[PDB]
Curated annotation (Swiss-Prot):
It catalyses: a beta-lactam + H2O = a substituted beta-amino acid. It comes from Escherichia coli. Pfam families: Beta-lactamase2. This is Beta-lactamase Toho-1. GO terms for molecular function: beta-lactamase activity. The class A beta-lactamase family has a specific amino-acid numbering system, sometimes called Ambler or ABL numbering and often misspelt as Amber. A multiple sequence alignment was used to derive a consensus sequence and then the consensus was numbered taking into account insertions and deletions. This allows use of identical numbers, e.g. for active site residues, despite differences in protein length. UniProt always uses natural numbering of residues, hence there appear to be differences in numbering between this entry and some papers. One of its GO terms (biological process) is beta-lactam antibiotic catabolic process. Monomer. Has strong cefotaxime-hydrolyzing activity. It is an enzyme of class 3 (hydrolase). NCBIfam families: bla_class_A, blaCTX-M.
Length: 256
């Protein structure tokens, strides 16, 4: 399996990070899982969870209305643009930040939290020492090689994604909502999902950016077997490099 990942990487012209956790026995399949990668929009999982964390202690929180102004729209706002001049609730922005990778949505949840640094401290509380968000959308998609900003390891995100969706990171109602947001993702058809059996159920969060950075983190629920948490990050040495969702799909095939 390590061999096939080495070859898929060499031929791909980029750098590939993978970490599959098999929750059956907590056994790991790792490849450059301790190297840093720009997270791009996979970072949005963190923001939405941080808001879900707040709702555990605050029952009016998810319903809070938030105004969407025309001054709020950025470069990619498939859902938030439909609510200009009106409002969206936090629950709705989190759904849209995760299901549609809406950048306007991401930016309203961060702002509600009070800064990218507020999302890092939340990651810290979970016990994620690696995760750092430093910028808002879309500039957290620059993904400059060696740039520490908005990065994390494949492993670190696998351990916290597993905790958030299958472990101690959130009380049940919150952990359930998060998972129902991840499963309903609309953007991941060509990434990790394309590499698995179709009958398997998948929650994921994609993320693409410059340097043909192409990411998908995911919880996979097989039909007869404990779940797996897979993180497939990928990035190239050339800034205008074409994203390669197909490479994440292949790595997924391999490891699983």
């Amino acid at each position: 399996v390590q061999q096939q990942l080495e070859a898929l990487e060499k031929s791909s012209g980029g750098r590939l990070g993978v970490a599959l956790i098999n929750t059956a026995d907590n056994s790991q399949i790792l490849y450059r899982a301790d190297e840093r990668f720009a997270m791009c929009s996979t970072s949005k999982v963190m923001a939405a969870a941080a808001v879900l964390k707040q709702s555990e202690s605050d029952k009016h929180l998810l319903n809070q209305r938030v105004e969407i102004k025309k001054s709020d729209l950025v470069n990619y706002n498939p859902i938030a643009e439909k609510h200009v001049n009106g409002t969206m609730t936090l629950a709705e922005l989190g759904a849209a930040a995760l299901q549609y990778s809406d950048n306007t949505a991401m930016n309203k949840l961060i702002a509600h939290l009070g800064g990218p640094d507020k999302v890092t401290a939340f990651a810290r509380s979970l016990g994620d020492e690696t995760f750092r968000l430093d910028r808002t959308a879309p500039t957290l998609n620059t993904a400059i090689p060696g740039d520490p900003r908005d990065t994390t390891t494949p492993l670190a995100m696998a351990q916290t994604l597993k905790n958030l969706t299958l472990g101690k990171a959130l009380a049940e109602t919150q952990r359930a909502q998060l998972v129902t947001w991840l499963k309903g993702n609309t953007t991941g058809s060509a990434s990790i999902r394309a590499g698995l059996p179709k009958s398997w159920v998948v929650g994921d969060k994609t993320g693409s950016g410059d340097y043909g950075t192409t990411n998908d983190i995911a919880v996979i629920w097989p039909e007869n077997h404990a779940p797996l948490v897979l993180v497939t990050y990928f990035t190239q040495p050339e800034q205008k490099a074409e994203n390669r969702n197909d490479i994440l799909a292949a790595a997924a095939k391999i490891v699983t």
